[PDB]
Design an enzyme around this catalytic site. Sequence first.
Site, PDB file in Angstrom:
ATOM      1  N   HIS D 140      -1.442   4.994 -20.716  1.00  0.00           N
ATOM      2  CA  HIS D 140      -1.314   6.234 -21.478  1.00  0.00           C
ATOM      3  C   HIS D 140      -0.222   6.196 -22.545  1.00  0.00           C
ATOM      4  O   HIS D 140      -0.202   7.088 -23.402  1.00  0.00           O
ATOM      5  CB  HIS D 140      -1.051   7.440 -20.550  1.00  0.00           C
ATOM      6  CG  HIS D 140      -2.252   7.877 -19.763  1.00  0.00           C
ATOM      7  ND1 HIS D 140      -3.454   8.207 -20.355  1.00  0.00           N
ATOM      8  CD2 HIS D 140      -2.439   8.024 -18.428  1.00  0.00           C
ATOM      9  CE1 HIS D 140      -4.327   8.539 -19.421  1.00  0.00           C
ATOM     10  NE2 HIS D 140      -3.737   8.436 -18.244  1.00  0.00           N
ATOM     11  N   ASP D 177      -9.768   2.822 -15.277  1.00  0.00           N
ATOM     12  CA  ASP D 177      -9.105   4.046 -14.839  1.00  0.00           C
ATOM     13  C   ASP D 177      -9.914   5.251 -15.305  1.00  0.00           C
ATOM     14  O   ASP D 177     -10.501   5.243 -16.391  1.00  0.00           O
ATOM     15  CB  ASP D 177      -7.675   4.108 -15.397  1.00  0.00           C
ATOM     16  CG  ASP D 177      -6.844   5.246 -14.799  1.00  0.00           C
ATOM     17  OD1 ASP D 177      -7.040   6.413 -15.176  1.00  0.00           O
ATOM     18  OD2 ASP D 177      -5.961   4.981 -13.960  1.00  0.00           O
ATOM     19  N   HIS D 179      -9.111   8.007 -16.423  1.00  0.00           N
ATOM     20  CA  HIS D 179      -8.599   8.730 -17.574  1.00  0.00           C
ATOM     21  C   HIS D 179      -8.585   7.833 -18.799  1.00  0.00           C
ATOM     22  O   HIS D 179      -8.499   6.612 -18.698  1.00  0.00           O
ATOM     23  CB  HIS D 179      -7.207   9.278 -17.311  1.00  0.00           C
ATOM     24  CG  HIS D 179      -7.144  10.144 -16.103  1.00  0.00           C
ATOM     25  ND1 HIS D 179      -6.430   9.798 -14.976  1.00  0.00           N
ATOM     26  CD2 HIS D 179      -7.746  11.326 -15.828  1.00  0.00           C
ATOM     27  CE1 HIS D 179      -6.574  10.748 -14.067  1.00  0.00           C
ATOM     28  NE2 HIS D 179      -7.372  11.682 -14.557  1.00  0.00           N
ATOM     29  N   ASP D 265      -8.759   5.913  -9.578  1.00  0.00           N
ATOM     30  CA  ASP D 265      -8.876   7.366  -9.562  1.00  0.00           C
ATOM     31  C   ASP D 265     -10.303   7.853  -9.837  1.00  0.00           C
ATOM     32  O   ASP D 265     -10.607   9.016  -9.558  1.00  0.00           O
ATOM     33  CB  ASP D 265      -7.874   8.012 -10.543  1.00  0.00           C
ATOM     34  CG  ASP D 265      -7.660   7.199 -11.841  1.00  0.00           C
ATOM     35  OD1 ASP D 265      -8.403   6.220 -12.118  1.00  0.00           O
ATOM     36  OD2 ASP D 265      -6.732   7.562 -12.602  1.00  0.00           O
TER      37      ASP D 265
HETATM   38  K     K Z   1     -10.270   4.284 -18.763  1.00  0.00           K
HETATM   39 ZN    ZN Z   2      -4.911   8.027 -14.656  1.00  0.00          ZN
END
Ligand code: K
Ligand code: ZN
Lengths: 365, 363, 365, 360
Positions: D140, D177, D179, D265
């Site tokens: 991120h 992931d 996200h 996740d």
């Molecule tokens: K991803």
């Molecule tokens: Zn994440």
Amino acid sequence: KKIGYVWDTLYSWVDTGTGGVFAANLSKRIQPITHHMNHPDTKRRFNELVMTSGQIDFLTPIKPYPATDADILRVHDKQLLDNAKNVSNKECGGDIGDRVTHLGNGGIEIAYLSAGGAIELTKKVISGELHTGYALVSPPGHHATKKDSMGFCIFNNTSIAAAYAKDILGLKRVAIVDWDVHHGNGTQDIWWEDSSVLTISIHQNKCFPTNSGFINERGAGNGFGYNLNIPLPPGSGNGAYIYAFEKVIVPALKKYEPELIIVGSGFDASILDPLSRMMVSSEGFKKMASLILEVSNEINGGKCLFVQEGGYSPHYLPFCGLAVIEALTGMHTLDDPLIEMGGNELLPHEKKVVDECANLIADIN
Amino acid sequence: KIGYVWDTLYSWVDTGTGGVFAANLSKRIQPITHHMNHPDTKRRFNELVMTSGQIDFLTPIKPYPATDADILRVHDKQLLDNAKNVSNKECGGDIGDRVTHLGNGGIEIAYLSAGGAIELTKKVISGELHTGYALVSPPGHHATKKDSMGFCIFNNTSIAAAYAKDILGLKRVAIVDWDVHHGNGTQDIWWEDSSVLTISIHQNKCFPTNSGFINERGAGNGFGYNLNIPLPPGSGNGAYIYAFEKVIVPALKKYEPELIIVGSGFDASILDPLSRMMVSSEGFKKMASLILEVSNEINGGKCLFVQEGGYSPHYLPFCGLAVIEALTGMHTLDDPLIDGGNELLPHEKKVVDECANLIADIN
Amino acid sequence: KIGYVWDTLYSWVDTGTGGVFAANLSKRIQPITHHMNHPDTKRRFNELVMTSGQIDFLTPIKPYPATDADILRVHDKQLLDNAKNVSNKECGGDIGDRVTHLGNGGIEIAYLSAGGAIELTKKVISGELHTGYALVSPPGHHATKKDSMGFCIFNNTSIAAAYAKDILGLKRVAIVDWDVHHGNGTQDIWWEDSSVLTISIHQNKCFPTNSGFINERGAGNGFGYNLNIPLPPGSGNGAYIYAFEKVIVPALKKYEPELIIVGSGFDASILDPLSRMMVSSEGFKKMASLILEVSNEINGGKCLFVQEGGYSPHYLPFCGLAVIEALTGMHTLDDPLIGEMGGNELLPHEKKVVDECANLIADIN
Amino acid sequence: KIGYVWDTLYSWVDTGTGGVFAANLSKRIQPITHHMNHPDTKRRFNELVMTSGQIDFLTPIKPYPATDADILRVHDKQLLDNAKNVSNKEGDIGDRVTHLGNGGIEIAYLSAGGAIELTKKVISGELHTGYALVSPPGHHATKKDSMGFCIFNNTSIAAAYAKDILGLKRVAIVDWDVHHGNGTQDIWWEDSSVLTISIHQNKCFPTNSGFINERGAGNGFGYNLNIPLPPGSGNGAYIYAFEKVIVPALKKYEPELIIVGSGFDASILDPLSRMMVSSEGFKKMASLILEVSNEINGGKCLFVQEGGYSPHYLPFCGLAVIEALTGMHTLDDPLIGGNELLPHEKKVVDECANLIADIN
Ligand SMILES: [K+]
Ligand SMILES: [Zn+2]
Ligand SMILES: [Cl-]
Ligand SMILES: [Cl-]
Ligand SMILES: [Cl-]
Ligand SMILES: [Cl-]
Ligand SMILES: [K+]
Ligand SMILES: [K+]
Ligand SMILES: [K+]
Ligand SMILES: [K+]
Ligand SMILES: [K+]
Ligand SMILES: [K+]
Ligand SMILES: [K+]
Ligand SMILES: [Zn+2]
Ligand SMILES: [Zn+2]
Ligand SMILES: [Zn+2]
């Protein structure tokens, strides 16, 4: 000097959901609690501080291997073993004997690996592969008798190792010196009639068990005079403990001339431990290990070794344990975060017990 | 008619940071989830009060927040300003002593803690209640005039005594503090003042390490009106009970206070990690009964108990219940561990007797 | 007048020993301290009710135990006796589905849980209260006549339904279950009975994996009086509200029940680990509001809410609090996550499911 | 010969303060002992690698701290300086939810160095592949900002290292992931030497990025591929995405190193997603990556840990990836849904496969 270090992830997997003095009991209004006393995080934090403090660099990791039934059966009766097998067989687990002691589903595997940890360390110390070492094993050992598991102890790890050093490696005098804050009644029973194993337990008078560990419990038969209890009063600290080590335990070991000294190294005598009223600080535990290292070097060429017993403060135990690791490696990598008021001065009623115990040395030959 | 003070917010103290073992990577102090002053200990007390059936004998008291004026009767503006500043930081912060921590908006709970001691005091002086237990958090007895410390933001019992003096017109008040750590804050606040008798029975040299000794007797018009009993490590029910009978109860009798406020800690218990004392739940009941007894003899049962420390989530609820039961006369639940230090020892006796000499100077 | 049923014993369930991930050394499922059904989730709901001020608009109602008779109106004697068996054991045991666990003495919590639904039911039916919320634990909706399962020992809502019928004389009751999992126990208990319309909106094929389909519609006098709405994984406020407005509310209007009982779980929320639904607190608020409204429109407002499942300690309190704000009308506090993470639009394949279910309404009479 | 990177310090991250549910007495958010990013989740994974006996098939790899220069190949000095400043205190770093304890930069440095150590030994041929169980995660953080539990972008740091120090010219980062890897997307936005792929839950975090139209700029147009799956997707949508977009994009681009951002996740029990991936779905995803790695660059791929927030189930998802690399399955998934491929899911993957044309 090669210093062994026995650790395994399974030691941190003991199931402590059920059991204990404060088991959930709705009828008696004992509310369920998240962290039980013997929660694995205390010894895991000790291991994790050994890693992140750099002490691990001065240590030789030693992988444990399961003890066998024959290793267990040299001190324990088949009744005790088959019981632990049958309790570990149930789903969800089971009490083991004294209600406080819990064995989870398949839990016997950890007890096997725990006992084998003490044997691996022993094998490597007596061979000359290692000068000394620390076995951070769990579950603990010193309350398990010939007949009974109790006090969180399934098998008497140090006794299993002492019988291994004798019956397999040919040693003829061993000494088990146990500074866990509770009486090592298990060790005392196993070797009660045997002079080839000097057993010493210093502990808090009347803590656990409440009715054992008194001065006049001295062995019997060929064993008379080869069990020594130092029951200090609540409140004792580095002062009383070092006095006891210098006036009683070190002269006792000098007299007996053991070819291997095994220390039951518990830390529940620590200043912050919830299951004692003793005031030993981490530097006291350092001076305790050094005195034992030193006298061992004097006689049997540093053949001594430390095996974890109890200890219940997740905050302070890691530094007590790290302090003992430093006395084996002689490298100081980290300060006690509490680097000193209370327990360092020797009080006369603490002295009156140790002077009494010093008379017992005359009966050791 | 027995009051009981409790509010859910007392169990919402944020204990993620701070502590003596506050996470510190350079010193290799690993983060832990359960610090000593975690809310579960005093929450388990309040829930045992509920599920033991004691609550049926108790009159609940809703606490209201203490005002700034209530805090300033005994604390300097510097202390209060400090707590408003730290309580304003978005993440909270250290209150000053690198142990006590105050969450963002955590001052709300500190006000409520002190106000709970004030609501119990109001209702006991007025006769609406005979006596009561205020299960407040955070505790108080380490806060001095100038400094918060040792998990204490505001000195609750002192704020209660000051309120009873300056608003309810009392002339003579005694604070009896049986928390295992010396009540250094109460000692400092009333050092020069004979109108609040301050007594601390505690473990010799535990916390703070630089206070609590016999020779600290107060100053000026207050000389002779502060009394410390520092018992040795290892003392149990016999030294504590003996101390209450040869020192604390004769002292209250002589001093004749219009009101007794007990700082009721339980960290002297046989199982507490922050003491080496051996008091059991039965031990705490007798200590409570002796204060009631002496309170009924000399001022009309005008006494009350205000929670201080205690850090054993397994055994504190039963020590607190045993004190509650000594207030209600009603037994509803056994202590599950009562199957020690019940015998008084010479070296505990010698301290206690040296302390009894000091009663002469109380007038 | 809004009732609120809580008791400290509801947060005393022993959950440290059982569940899908019960400790099993042989399978290397490591012991853990927080299981899914830990009481802290529902305890934090009750504490938010307290600390938000909502408690000042509520009438606390004290629960009393359900009797054996109350339990037997819907459950076989084997279930009841098997609960006493497991409960009396030192340290408890599996109730017989390898997931559900009964602590030592834990049947007392089971009784008080069903008692909490009865007491609210009595007070609502008698006019003493207009409505209320029973924050009870353990939940009930998975318990059949024969079997406890899925953390449920007794079917709380069905026991309250059977009490309202057989003691207070009601003839038509509706149980509306919005727990993310299928109420198989409520469906089974009233499968053959038309005097209890049973509606369950759930995640298609979560728990149990073998029930909840649209074609399960009852039998005998009960044909047409069981209605399943199996929404797809991923559904949020958009599909849940459409289902209420197009199926559940019209079915209630057609049924004209004397009392509406809501099994109010919060495990369809956006953060719950045991579902893939995306309902937010504002979704649960509108759902409660729609029930309140149809109930005030037909049967004089006689409805009540009984807590079922929910497993997010962070977010369940605000979901539960949102339901209370639908009852009291008082907005004390904002949801600290207001959202754009998805689910507010009604997707085509979500409407396809709701529209099918709306055809089943024609057979409710 | 399969490498495994772990250090005790990765489980010493201090998650007592901070988070989206950080205590707040005025908003009545009660303090909680277990935050979402608590170290127990990834410690259990590591402890399952030990007790399952997978460790006996692995070569342990000691990590060493990434240097400041390593960080500055992909991060602005302000990002780096902000972290040293926050680390020196007894604080929040950027987006309120990212918290760094006192001295915590030490762990972030050790996290990036862990992904560098694995990368060195995989390029050199000392290992064929491996898994780096590092913490804190990285995908991120952008050039300018740390966010979302992420201090340093580990996989991007390792990709910059493989290029500047080790001389690679084409690297691919595959991020699974749940996200969006907005950090990785931002760092290589104008750059075609690093094919950046992210498969994530549509509009989960950040809620405003991760869409298909986000394809890079300048030299980098066509070398960023987002697959934003709808909530509820599972083994079906994911395996179709891998067989029909990710693998063929990788076959076309022919990287000399594949770096997998390995989050769990997306698993069926994770609180921070609505995806239905099971442990066998992760094992299969890992296997497809190895399969194409051996077909087109000699098995040069490695896996670097990102997110995942289920202490109960994550360890079996991570074990399932370890089992893929080792080819040795010595332990069953105790829970063993969305195995079916839904039309609205296929519509997303189908539109993404069109994107492979602009990869050259
Ligand atoms: K991803
Ligand atoms: Zn994440
Ligand atoms: Cl316990
Ligand atoms: Cl602490
Ligand atoms: Cl579970
Ligand atoms: Cl959080
Ligand atoms: K001992
Ligand atoms: K002996
Ligand atoms: K005074
Ligand atoms: K005191
Ligand atoms: K029905
Ligand atoms: K349902
Ligand atoms: K790129
Ligand atoms: Zn012990
Ligand atoms: Zn204290
Ligand atoms: Zn459920």
